[PDB]
Amino acid sequence: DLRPNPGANKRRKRVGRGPGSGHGKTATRGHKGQKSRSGGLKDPRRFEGGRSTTLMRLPKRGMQGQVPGEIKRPRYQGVNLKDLARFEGEVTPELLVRAGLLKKGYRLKILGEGEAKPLKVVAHAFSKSALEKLKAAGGEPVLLEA
Amino acid sequence: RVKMHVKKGDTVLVASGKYKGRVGKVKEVLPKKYAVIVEGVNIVKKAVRVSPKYPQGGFIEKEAPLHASKVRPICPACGKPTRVRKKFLENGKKIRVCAK
Amino acid sequence: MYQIPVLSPSGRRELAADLPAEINPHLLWEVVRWQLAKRRRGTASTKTRGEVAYSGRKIWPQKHTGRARHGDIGAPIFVGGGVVFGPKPRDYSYTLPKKVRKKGLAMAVADRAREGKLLLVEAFAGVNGKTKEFLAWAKEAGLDGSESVLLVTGNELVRRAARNLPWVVTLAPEGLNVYDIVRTERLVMDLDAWEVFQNRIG
Amino acid sequence: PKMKTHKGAKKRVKITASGKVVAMKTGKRHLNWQKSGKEIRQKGRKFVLAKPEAERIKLLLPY
RNA sequence: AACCUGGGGAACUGAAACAUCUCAGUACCCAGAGGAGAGGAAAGAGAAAUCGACUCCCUGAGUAGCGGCGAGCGAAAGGGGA
RNA sequence: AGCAGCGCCAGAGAGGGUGAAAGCCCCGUAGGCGAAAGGUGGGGGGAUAGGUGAGGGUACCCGAGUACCCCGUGGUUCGUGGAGCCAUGGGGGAAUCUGGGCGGACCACCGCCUAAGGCUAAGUACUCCGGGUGACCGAUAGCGCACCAGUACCGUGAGGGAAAGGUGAAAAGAACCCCGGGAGGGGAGUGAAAUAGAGCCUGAAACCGUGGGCUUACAAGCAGUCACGGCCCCGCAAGGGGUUGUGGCGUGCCUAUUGAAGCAUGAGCCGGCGACUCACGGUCGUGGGCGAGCUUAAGCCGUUGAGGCGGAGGCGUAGGGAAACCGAG
Known part of the structure; x- marks a missing residue:
């Protein structure tokens, strides 16, 4: 294969x-x-x-902003356990962002539907839903603290 | 600076054009224009007298300034490029295997 | 494919290659276009009708004059006055997905493989940087000058050699690019240089 | 360069997961007096726009 | 030449009028500085019993927020690098 | 220098010149050497200036019309807003660590910090200046200026502001003769070329002329166009061209408009210049790569047209709700 005829594969013609x-x-x-x-x-x-x-059309989005602005508050990250049950082991926030669902929201909130795993899933917040399916699977520790 | 060129007033061959092969003694190098002169180029200057002084100026066909890249020097051979070796003291030029 | 010729003193051996199977025309072209425009130097420059060295005065009245109608001798309809949409120094580069330069580097290299114009060598008995040495060497390896070759070794001495040759383009193992694999007809490189390309994708 | 999210927009509209611009109903905050309960209720809703709805999504996007 | 700091400081213009606003601390005037200038050892940052002079780039981010909440305006820490 | 025969250097086959097209002729190129003098220089060495300790007791010290408060203000994302902070025009006015500030009016707790003195390299901007390079210009372009240009020239003045580059390989720049006062030609001569003869390479169009073919003085016109005839012209032949006599038909171009040949607009003519671009961010579409993942920004290293590392960050995976919150709700 040489330099004569790479040619934009018939479909991209810059034809302005x-x-x-x-x-x-x-x-x-x-x-x-x-x-x-x-x-x-x-x-x-x-x-x-x-x-x-x-x-x-009128403003309703009040609490739009004082003058300081945005308040220092935790930001729990929703993530379906069905998206967790993929890989196995003792999953933690760390092991979670270490993958591709989180991006440093610190607080994690494993939840949703599907089939949990008989594993340990350390997290910052569960759902009364995930909690029980998971109890019907393995174990699950609450958050650390602050 | 670096206007220094092939050679000076001496015996130089011509691989130029119309005088390819003509070899003569070059009597003037003019570094201002990169052209020398031998016995070769000889165009006929029809003009009368170049400067008003003196009677007629003769149809002098005298040498015409040739471009220096068309002239190669020569010694015990037939004209080489000019490398330059050095002594214990000063420095001159030695051709492709000879001297002087 | 898996059949790549290896040159050694022990004779002729072969290695096994994990290069790509099927080759993608376009994809190899996009990679070249990038390569050929990241090196492009945005330089062409023109002056608007303000960057122009003219003065501003309203050349003449606009009213009851009889004459056309002009502001300053800068207007682009004027002559000498600023160009309209003149080329201004820009960056003809873009960020090509790294996942792509590879799939290109991998397809070119895998092309000469499938065309038998690749040659992995060790025994560079054409040592010490002397093109003479290199040319009595390439001979033994086959390279006769008929085909343009890409030389890719981490050995300066080896580089310097064929470095000035007209039918070859020297190169470090790192430099390998999806353009200079498609310039040469061949491609010769150190068994360590393919040991460092296959380190990037293999 | 780098368009600015029309601030006066987002302060009164939200765009839904699907992509339809939900808006707050107009006609309740001043006209009032004794507007039948059935009135000030059916006004407490949000709703959809239409063709301007697509003009809206044009004003944001970073958001 | 240009760049820089400080002292002063426009209107057209945009708001499809036009005062607040915008254009903008731009244009220009002035003074001073040097190969740079400024900035600088926290009465800091701001929520981690934590970061730790300054400068610049990237980002954060058209975000927080500012605005006849109109036109429009537009940060900071933190992170990445010099 | 090309074509050809046979050779050769290459850490040099970038580039440029040589009467055309040279790795080898020239200047260079790659590689390697070089400073009496001035300049530069912690990159290295050396020295100095300056700096280094605990406990306890004492209650001294610790930047003043300042802090701080109020009035008028600016800066800041903050336009008087719940308006803090830094800065300060006006007024009042402390304290020496059991002190003062700040943590967005304010109070309490808890934390941050030492104002009211001062200096500090580096990273940074810039481009008169020198060097490198160009999917930059090639004389109406490129700086206004390739050229004796910030000149000529215009303006009192600030200021404005041109045009204009080309013989040739070499002046070999046309001796002498001829007409002519000169300019200027005609021969001779130089030159490969002189219709390259000097504002001279190339020589386009308008425009002006000279010779020839056709054609016109009873003919009415957007000038063309069908049809035939005569004449003149290349061609064995059939045919092709040039012209145009007669008949038929025929309201220029653009623009602007309901509507134009229009007595509406614009253009004397020719040549050159002349108008939908670019950056960043969107939204479609499209060609690809990867895919519950996709992707780096700045830089760091490398290259001297060589790319690679760099996940900070970004978009995506969960939505609803003004929020607190909840969550395939």
Whole structure:
């Protein structure tokens, strides 16, 4: 295999669409031809009409923020035991993030449905659901403390 | 600096163009333009007299400045490139196997 | 595939290779495009109608003059005045998934394998950096100059040798790239250099 | 560069797991007086928008 | 030349008007500094009985939050590196 | 220098010049040497300046119109907001560690910290300056300036601001003769080329002319176009071209518009310049790689067009709810 003919495997053609020509996208060039077509208009994303977007919908999301802001609070991480029962052993928060479900939320909350395992699953919070299925499996220690 | 070139006023061969093979004694190197002169190039200057002083100036066909890359020096052989060995004292040039 | 020729004093032996089976056209190309644009140097430069060394004055009145209508002699419709959408120094590079450069390096190397243009060597009896030495050596190994070759050893002396040769491109074992395996017709490298590529994927 | 989540948006809309923009019902906080119980209740709900709903999701996304 | 710190400090403009806001401490004026300048041994950071001068890059993060809660504005610790 | 015959160096086959296309002719290139002088320099060595201990008793000391409070303010993500903190214009005004600040009005507890003195390398920015390189420009481009340009020239002045590069391998730059006062030509000559003859390589279009073929002085027009005829022209032949007499038909271009040949817009003509780009972030689509995983950012090392390491972080796996919380609810 040589350098003649790697060629973007027939399907990616960079074929841009330069619209300054005589036939095709032309004259007005791109979808224009009218007016209010200079350096662009006001949005349209959210804003416009000149009436009231729809900013008529009203805030409810109170507790939106004082002036200090966000409070130092634990952040329990939900993770289905069915997603745990994959690998085996004595699973802990450590062994959990050490995989691909957590990303340092510190607090873990094994829960959900499926089939628990007869293993030990150290965690920061269970669900009354997981707790019992798991009692019907092996053991389970609560959190450490603070 | 480094304008120093192949050679000086002496016996030099010509592998140039129209004078390929002509060998003469080069009587003037002009480092300002990288061109020498032997007995080879000899275009006829039709002009009268170069400078107003003196009667007529002769149809002098005298040597014309040749480009130096078209001239190779020569000693007991037929013209080599110029390596340079050194003594216990000063330093001059020795060709591909000979001297001087 | 599994059949890679090995050159030694004990004679001719073979190794077993765990290189990739099926080769992916595109994938090997994307890897090259990357390689060929990360090295690209964003330099082409042009001046807008402001970076332009002109002054600003309204050239003439705009009203009752009879003449066209112009602001400054900088306007891009003017001549000499700033280009419109002129190329400005940029970074023609992107971050290609590492999981891909490999699958490329692995497919090129595995290509010459399937084309019999690979050669693993040990006995570099063409020692001490003297191209003369290398050329009486390549001979014994087959390399006649007909095919462009990629040399890849961690041995400077070995490098220096074929280093100036026109039909070969020298290289450290680390350098191996999904472009310079697709330049050469062949690929020769130290039994230690394949012991360090197969260390990355093998 | 790096668009800013329209702040005035998120302060009054939430986007659901599916992707439909849920919004708070308008018409309860001022017009009131004696609006039939059946009124101020059916207003306590949230709900869906439609085509502007898609304009909304355009204003966030980092969120 | 440009960059830097401090002293001063615009309006167009955007808000599809326009005052708060924006443009912005930008433009420019001034003074001073040097190959840099500034910054710097915590009356620090802020929730870990824990980090530990400063500077910069990456990130945190368009997050916390600020805003005729409109236009828009926009951090810090912590983590990664110099 | 090419084509060819046979050779050769390569730690050098980057590049450039040589009358064209040179690894080998030239300058270089790779490799390795070099400073009386000035400059630079903890990278190394040496020295100094300056620095190092416990317990106990005493109650001395520990940065003042400052802290702190209030009024007017700025900085900060903070626009007076529940408005702290740092900074300070105005007023009042401490304490020496059983002291003072801060932990977002405030109080209590508990923790952080030593204001009101000062200096500190490094990482950092920059590009007049020198060097390297370019999926940068190639004379209407690239700096305004390739050139005797911040000049000519315009403005009182601040200030503004051009155009203009090319013979040739070598001046070998046309002796002499001829017409002519000169300019300028005609021969001769140089040169491979002179229709490369000097603003001279290439020489396009508009535009101006000279010779020839066809054609026009009863003919009415967006100039073209069908049809036939005559003439002139290449061709054995059939045919092809040039022109255009007669008949038929025929409302320029763009733009702007309900509507244009329009007595609406714009263009004398030709040549050159001239307008949907780029960064970052989205949202589709698409081609791929990997997949309950996907992926690095800055950098570190390496390279001198060589990539690799770097999981910080990011998006994804659980949602609901204003939150506390709960959770396939």
